[PDB]
Every structure is written in C-alpha cells, then in structure tokens.
C-alpha cells in the first residue's frame with residue numbers, strides 16, 4: 001500500500017460514489033470545478049494498491065485572501081477523506097490523515113477544520129458520516145455545533161406578499177453598487193465568493209438585489225438548472241429531481257435588519273424561482289437560530305453537518 | 314376556528330404532503346394501512362376554518378397487549394401533529410395538543426411520547442422537524458437521544474461471506490416454519506416483535522418477506538425484508554417515494570440471546586442482503602436503529618439517512 005499524490009479525478013469520483021454516492025452523489029464536473037478553481041494551497045493524497053485507488057484525502061491551508069481579509073496561515077482544512085469500504089480498519093485512513101496533518105503542521109497550521117473550506121463539499125462532518133466522528137475524536141478533533149442544509153418545494157405553497165424599497169434581479173449596471181455594498185456589509189468570504197464566481201460563470205440573472213431608492217441594501221444568490229456556476233445549494237441536485245434549484249447566501253445591511261426586509265427579499269427571490277418553474281430547492285449552510293426565518297416559507301432541515309476542530313499542540 | 318374529531322383521511326394526507334411531503338411523502342394506502350389496523354385506543358382531532366381542515370393531531374393510549382405483555386395504560390403517544398403552513402403561530406397547535414393531552418391524562422396516561430407508537434410514522438421527532446423541538450419543550454417534553462433510519466444501495470458493493478460455523482444455515486421462510494417462528498419469538502422477542510408478526514401476517518405479510526437463521530433444525534433468528542412486491546408496507550419502506558426504482562428495506566433483525574456475539578447476526582444480515590441483491594434491489598432502508606448498532610450495518614455500506622429524537626413528557 002502506497003501513499004502518494006494523485007490528480008486522477010475520475011478514480012476519486014468513482015470511489016466517492018461507490019462509498020457515499022447514495023447521499024452525496026458526485027458528478028465529475030462539480031469535482032473539477034471545485035478543485036481546479038480553489039486558490040488555496042491544496043493537495044490530494046491517495047492510497048494505492050498497485051495502480052488501484054483505495055482511499056484519498058483532500059486538504060488545504062488558508063493562503064489566499066478572503067475579500068478584505070488576509071489569509072490566516074494557522075488554519076488548515078480536511079476538505080474530504082474517504083477509504084473504500086472493503087479496505088476499512090487496516091490503517092489507511094490514519095496514514096492519509098497523518099500525511100495531510102503533518103504537511104499542514106510543518107507549514108504552520110495550528111487549527112484544523114473538517115470541511116468549511118473554500119469550494120467545500122461539506123460545511124462540517126455530515127450526519128450521514130456520523131460514524132467517522134469517532135475516528136476524528138480519537139485523533140484530537142472536538143465536535144462542536146451543527147449547520148443545516150434546508151429543503152423546500154416552491155411549487156407547492158402560495159404566500160401573500162414598503163415605500164422606496166424594491167427587489168429585482170441584478171442588471172449588469174448594478175455590478176458597481178453590489179461590490180460597494182459587499183465591501184461594506186459582507187467583506188470577507190461572501191465578497192471573495194462574488195469576485196471569484198463572476199470569473200467562473202456566475203451570471204447577473206442568479207443574483208437578486210434589494211434597494212432603498214438607488215442604494216443596494218442586501219442580496220440573494222439563486223440557482224436553477226440554467227445556472228452555469230454550480231454552487232453549494234445545488235451540489236446535490238441528483239437528489240432534487242427535475243427543475244431543481246437553490247438559494248444562498250442571503251444578507252441585509254445590519255442597519256436595516258429586523259424590519260421585514262429580509263423577509264421581503266426572501267419572498268421575492270422565491271417568487272422569481274417559482275416563475276422559473278423551480279420545484280425542489282435547497283438553502284445551504286444555515287445555523288439553527290436562522291432556520292425559522294426560512295421555515296416560514298416551508299423550508300425544513302434536510303442535511304446536518306457537525307463542526308469539528310483540532311488544535312495543534 | 315373549530316376543533317373536532319375527523320376521519321377524513323384524504324384531506325389529512327393532502328395536508329401532510331403540502332407541509333412535509335418533500336421529506337416524508339405520504340400516500341393514502343400507507344396512511345390507511347397504519348391508522349386503520351392500529352389496535353390502541355386511537356383518535357384524530359382536526360382543526361377547521363369552516364369546512365376546511367387546517368391542522369390535525371393523531372394520538373393513542375397503550376391499551377392493547379404487546380405479545381406476552383399487558384398494555385401499560387400510563388403510556389400515551391402523539392403519533393403526528395401538523396398545522397398548515399399558512400396558519401402557524403396562531404395557537405392552533407397548542408389547542409390541538411391541549412385536547413389530545415387532556416383526553417389522554419383523563420384515561421390515566423402519565424407518560425406522553427412523541428412518536429414510537431405501534432404503526433408509527435416516526436420513531437421520534439424527525440430532524441427535519443427540529444424546529445418543533447422547541448414547541449414540545451415549552452409544553453414540558455424533554456429531549457433525549459437519537460434513533461436513525463439508515464440507507465444503502467445494495468447493488469453497488471460486493472462482500473465476502475463471513476466464515477460460518479457448521480450446523481448454521483440461513484433461508485427464506487417457508488409456510489411450515491411458521492409454528493417454530495412463533496416458538497422462537499415467544500421465547501426470545503415476546504413483546505413488540507411477536508405482536509407485529511401476529512398482526513402483520515393478517516394484513517398481507519408473506520413468507521417471502523421473512524428470512525430465518527437455523528442451528529440445524531431450530532429457528533435462532535430472523536429478519537424482515539421488503540421490496541416493490543411486498544404488499545405489507547412496513548417502516549423501512551414508508552418513504553419509498555424517495556427511494557427510486559427497485560427500492561427495498563430490512564428491519565427488524567434479531568438473534569436469540571444465547572447465540573449472540575458469535576458472528577451469527579452478521580451472517581443473517583449478509584444473507585438477507587444477498588437475497589435482496591438477487592431480487593434486483595437498489596436503494597434500501599434499515600429503520601429505527603440506535604447509535605451503538607450503526608456500524609454493524611455500516612460494514613455493509615449503510616449510512617445514517619434520517620434522524621429522530623426521543624421526547625417524553627411526564628404528567629405532573
């Protein structure tokens with residue numbers, strides 16, 4: 001059994017699907033999009049029996065800026081790790097994770113996270129992967145709070161509907177105002193996302209803006225089967241059926257919160273998706289305390305993910 | 314707004330599907346199967362605006378024996394409660410649960426449970442219904458541990474048979490094994506599983522849905538398996554609308570206490586799955602498992618799919 005670098009994305013995707021594809025169905029397009037475009041220092045280590053892939057870990061160090069933020073080099077990530085089911089409990093996972101942790105630690109990482117990376121597949125350890133929590137815990141990762149992907153069917157329910165506030169799809173002329181808003185209200189990871197996604201296929205039609213007069217005060221990113229950029233809400237579209245969609249992120253300026261404007265933006269974003277003939281759709285990577293906000297629109301927790309962090313000693 | 318008894322199963326199914334049908338797709342065949350054949354003292358109270366159902370609660374008291382066991386009349390169950398999305402936060406849920414609880418308390422109930430009933434739809438509060446936990450908490454229910462439904466695709470993996478001791482062999486049930494099945498169950502699982510065997514055989518369960526393990530001639534264990542031909546719809550295949558073409562399921566599975574911890578369960582499981590895999594089964598579910606038993610099933614590539622939280626209110 002050899003441990004060595006690999007970039008055979010087809011072999012990886014095949015193994016992923018054989019092992020967890022029922023719940024995290026992976027296509028090669030998504031895998032490539034996410035891996036090739038990520039700007040962090042990144043590596044894939046594979047476990048091999050001769051030329052046959054029997055497991056892999058993907059891992060990253062935070063070395064690229066996030067909007068107005070400079071990289072914190074102390075932070076590393078396990079994007080994913082999977083050993084094939086017929087090769088479990090032989091030490092391969094341990095060897096893979098050791099290789100990745102050693103490399104990260106040698107490069108200055110002091111805090112290791114399970115998912116939550118740029119171009120993540122996972123916000124945290126999936127509930128479907130709950131048995132792996134024992135493997136991580138033994139290896140010094142602390143199990144923290146939960147995040148949730150929510151699911152709803154916008155075709156299924158009708159909802160009932162403020163001076164100077166308007167919500168419309170983005171037009172190309174809005175670009176400048178969108179970026180000023182982000183620089184001001186969401187200047188980290190959501191800003192970085194907007195910058196990078198526009199360089200790899202996101203259209204203005206996927207963005208809804210709420211304005212007060214001329215000024216942008218919040219946004220959503222929405223998804224359907226015509227979107228070219230494949231974002232987290234539609235990662236798992238194989239489970240969502242036909243005319244699938246998604247929504248996230250969504251944010252309002254802190255100054256304008258708690259007066260129903262989030263609710264208006266959400267309502268109008270959904271109506272737009274509804275008129276695009278969307279049915280089943282996902283809202284990604286929510287905290288518990290915000291579920292009810294989307295739940296008023298009949299969204300329910302679908303998938304859960306457990307945050308998990310190892311402090312290097 | 315009016316609260317009254319209802320048996321309009323169609324309107325209930327529609328309301329269910331409108332509100333939670335993306336993750337718990339209900340149909341009338343399943344609903345009727347589980348509601349009508351339940352033998353407990355049972356009721357549905359509906360909430361209505363004029364003629365229109367806007368909410369319901371289904372609830373039960375343990376009044377019917379469970380195999381060798383007498384009922385414990387102190388246990389009541391909330392089988393399900395759903396208020397329509399367009400009428401939430403108006404106190405309808407409170408009203409319905411108040412009436413359900415009051416009736417149950419007056420018949421001698423001291424322990425109220427969220428799901429887990431006979432002919433349940435849920436083992437506990439679904440994780441998809443997590444925001445309800447807070448609703449139940451306000452009422453004095455206490456949140457305990459979790460159960461899981463597991464999922465796998467038995468078409469995608471091959472396993473080496475586990476190495477088997479002489480005298481043991483595993484076979485689909487035949488119609489004469491019946492006598493010795495019930496002797497095994499009376500001896501080894503004489504509550505809920507015995508009872509369900511009794512009842513399920515009367516409403517379409519078939520020998521082909523049962524696998525049995527034997528030491529020479531004696532029945533030492535069983536599994537219940539399911540596919541698109543099963544006419545009894547049990548827990549593993551409740552949500553078969555989410556499982557695609559050629560769905561299946563497995564559960565319960567049990568080994569006589571004296572034969573445990575020697576690999577016999579693993580053999581029973583392996584062969585039960587082999588049978589399924591030969592029947593062209595693809596995605597399948599294993600229902601209502603505890604955390605300590607997930608990895609027994611996980612060896613065969615099963616993964617937790619749905620989670621339910623145990624929740625109990627003590628009447629004071």
Ligand SMILES: CC(=O)SCCNC(=O)CCNC(=O)[C@H](O)C(C)(C)COP(=O)(O)OP(=O)(O)OC[C@H]1O[C@@H](n2cnc3c(N)ncnc32)[C@H](O)[C@@H]1OP(=O)(O)O
Nearest residue numbers: 080081082083088089090091092093094114115125129132
């Ligand atoms: C951020 C994320 O990626 S979250 C998603 C996590 N991934 C998954 O859940 C996918 C499914 N699971 C898996 O792929 C695997 O179960 C993994 C990756 C979690 C673990 O890989 P494995 O190769 O089984 O790990 P490994 O065999 O090193 O360790 C498992 C146990 O077997 C033990 N072991 C090692 N060698 C042997 C042996 N020869 N015989 C028996 N046991 C052994 C290890 O000591 C370990 O026990 P411990 O945890 O008590 O120390």
Ligand SMILES: CC(=O)SCCNC(=O)CCNC(=O)[C@H](O)C(C)(C)COP(=O)(O)OP(=O)(O)OC[C@H]1O[C@@H](n2cnc3c(N)ncnc32)[C@H](O)[C@@H]1OP(=O)(O)O
Nearest residue numbers: 393394395396401402403404405406407427442445448451
């Ligand atoms: C065992 C099982 O069935 S588990 C599955 C449970 N069901 C579900 O999850 C299905 C989806 N959810 C629902 O159908 C609903 O949200 C339910 C059934 C959980 C709650 O129903 P509702 O009718 O909205 O509840 P109800 O209005 O009585 O009270 C809830 C809240 O409404 C508000 N409220 C209560 N009464 C009033 C009133 N008269 N006017 C305005 N607001 C009110 C309170 O904020 C209360 O808060 P709390 O939840 O902290 O107590």
Ligand SMILES: [Cl-]
Nearest residue numbers: 186188189190
């Ligand atoms: Cl941000």
